[PDB]
């Protein structure tokens, strides 16, 4: 009879609802490819006639149970159901040609448009050989009528999260005369490196594939479009930008100074510690304030702060 689409869309967000892809308290990093999924005929948890607020509440049952409880109940009670791209019941995320884009995975079901009586358990099991892979089990009641149209979709899009924990160093150069006053510097050339196995990495400007930075080794920084340079803008900020960190010791190496004229960051491996304190990124030693979402800020770019001090 009749059949739908669910696409599965699996992304990497940072910590400050299956259907939406804007999913509130978090936000997209830069597609991950390689996570797996099986998919359940959970047609027989329905009951006809059955109200749309028994269908939320079903659905809210299983999604707070874990991966591992919800395949235990599923292995034991329910069949592998679906055309997937691995087979039935089973999902791998690949690139989309058609859509652009990665960490995508469909598969065909056959649904009921006109009456509650399909639905399928999704559960994400282990990927293809540092982050939080917290998507949930995923409970599809057909038919699901769009807003717009009241009739039934034909196609569902999922939006499993997955967390990825990063920071976003920034810092401000300021030129300082011997007669005490100062100013921002423009035009100050950084590059990032770090000490790798004894030698120096530079950041490079290879594409985030996963959460993945990648790093090469260097005869010369400044002239090499391989390494990702960092200027000092109009208000001496220094900023990362759309580049993130992981955890570790990095630092901010100067290739030209401004005409006149080794930074350490510390970036610790959670926001906030046993305590409840918050765990600051260090700037040579100076904690450097910084958001959930990374953003310099007008007020932290009006602060001027962290600053470091070129002499003339």
Same mark, same amino acid.
Do not use: C
């Given at each position: 009879?009749?059949?739908?689409?669910?696409?599965?869309?699996?992304?990497?967000?940072?910590?400050? $609802?299956?259907?939406?892809? #804007?999913?509130?308290?978090?936000?997209?990093?830069?597609?991950?490819?390689?996570?797996?999924?099986? !998919?359940?005929?959970?047609?027989?948890?329905?009951?006809?006639n059955?109200?749309?607020? &028994?269908?939320?509440?079903l659905? @809210?049952?299983?999604?707070?149970?874990?991966?591992?409880?919800a395949? +235990?109940?599923?292995? =034991?009670?329910?069949?592998? &159901?679906?055309?997937?791209?691995?087979?039935?019941?089973?999902?791998?995320?690949?690139?989309?040609?058609?859509?652009g884009?990665?960490?995508?995975?469909?598969?065909?079901?056959?649904?009921?448009?006109?009456?509650?009586?399909?639905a399928?358990?999704?559960?994400?099991?282990?990927?293809?050989? $540092?982050?939080?892979?917290?998507?949930?089990?995923?409970?599809?009641?057909?038919? !699901?009528?769009?807003?717009?149209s /009241?009739?039934?979709?034909?196609?569902?899009?999922?939006?499993? +999260?997955?967390?990825?924990?990063?920071?976003?160093?920034?810092?401000?150069?300021?030129?300082?005369?011997? #007669?005490?006053?100062?100013?921002?510097?423009?035009? =100050?050339?950084? &590059?990032?490196?770090?000490?790798?196995?004894?030698?120096?990495?530079?950041? $490079?400007?290879?594409?985030?594939? #996963?959460?993945?930075?990648?790093?090469?080794?260097?005869? @010369?920084?400044?002239?090499? @479009?391989?390494?990702?340079?960092?200027?000092?803008?109009?208000?001496?900020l !220094?900023?990362?930008? *759309?580049?993130?960190?992981?955890?570790? *010791?990095?630092?901010?190496?100067?290739?030209? /100074?401004?005409?006149?004229?080794?930074?350490?960051? *510390?970036?610790?491996?959670?926001?906030? #510690?046993? $305590?409840?304190?918050?765990?600051?990124?260090?700037? @040579?030693?100076?904690?450097?304030?910084?958001?959930?979402?990374?953003?310099?800020?007008?007020?932290?770019?009006?602060?001027?702060?962290?600053?470091?001090?070129?002499? &003339?």
């Amino acid at each position: 009879d009749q059949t739908a689409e669910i696409v599965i869309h699996k992304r990497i967000y940072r910590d400050i $609802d299956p259907n939406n892809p #804007d999913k509130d308290g978090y936000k997209l990093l830069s597609g991950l490819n390689g996570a797996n999924f099986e !998919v359940y005929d959970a047609s027989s948890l329905l009951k006809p006639n059955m109200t749309p607020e &028994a269908i939320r509440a079903l659905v @809210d049952r299983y999604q707070n149970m874990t991966r591992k409880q919800a395949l +235990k109940f599923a292995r =034991a009670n329910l069949k592998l &159901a679906g055309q997937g791209n691995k087979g039935i019941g089973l999902m791998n995320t690949k690139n989309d040609p058609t859509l652009g884009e990665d960490g995508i995975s469909r598969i065909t079901v056959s649904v009921d448009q006109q009456a509650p009586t399909k639905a399928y358990l999704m559960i994400e099991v282990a990927p293809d050989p $540092d982050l939080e892979r917290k998507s949930s089990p995923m409970l599809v009641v057909f038919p !699901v009528t769009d807003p717009i149209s /009241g009739n039934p979709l034909q196609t569902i899009h999922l939006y499993p +999260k997955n967390v990825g924990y990063v920071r976003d160093p920034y810092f401000f150069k300021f030129g300082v005369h011997p #007669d005490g006053t100062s100013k921002r510097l423009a035009g =100050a050339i950084f &590059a990032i490196y770090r000490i790798e196995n004894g030698k120096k990495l530079y950041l $490079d400007m290879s594409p985030v594939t #996963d959460l993945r930075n990648k790093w090469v080794s260097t005869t @010369d920084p400044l002239h090499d @479009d391989r390494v990702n340079k960092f200027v000092s803008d109009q208000d001496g900020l !220094v900023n990362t930008g *759309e580049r993130f960190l992981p955890a570790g *010791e990095y630092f901010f190496e100067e290739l030209q /100074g401004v005409p006149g004229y080794a930074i350490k960051i *510390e970036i610790p491996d959670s926001w906030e #510690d046993e $305590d409840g304190n918050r765990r600051f990124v260090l700037i @040579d030693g100076q904690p450097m304030q910084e958001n959930f979402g990374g953003v310099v800020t007008p007020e932290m770019i009006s602060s001027g702060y962290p600053r470091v001090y070129n002499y &003339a």
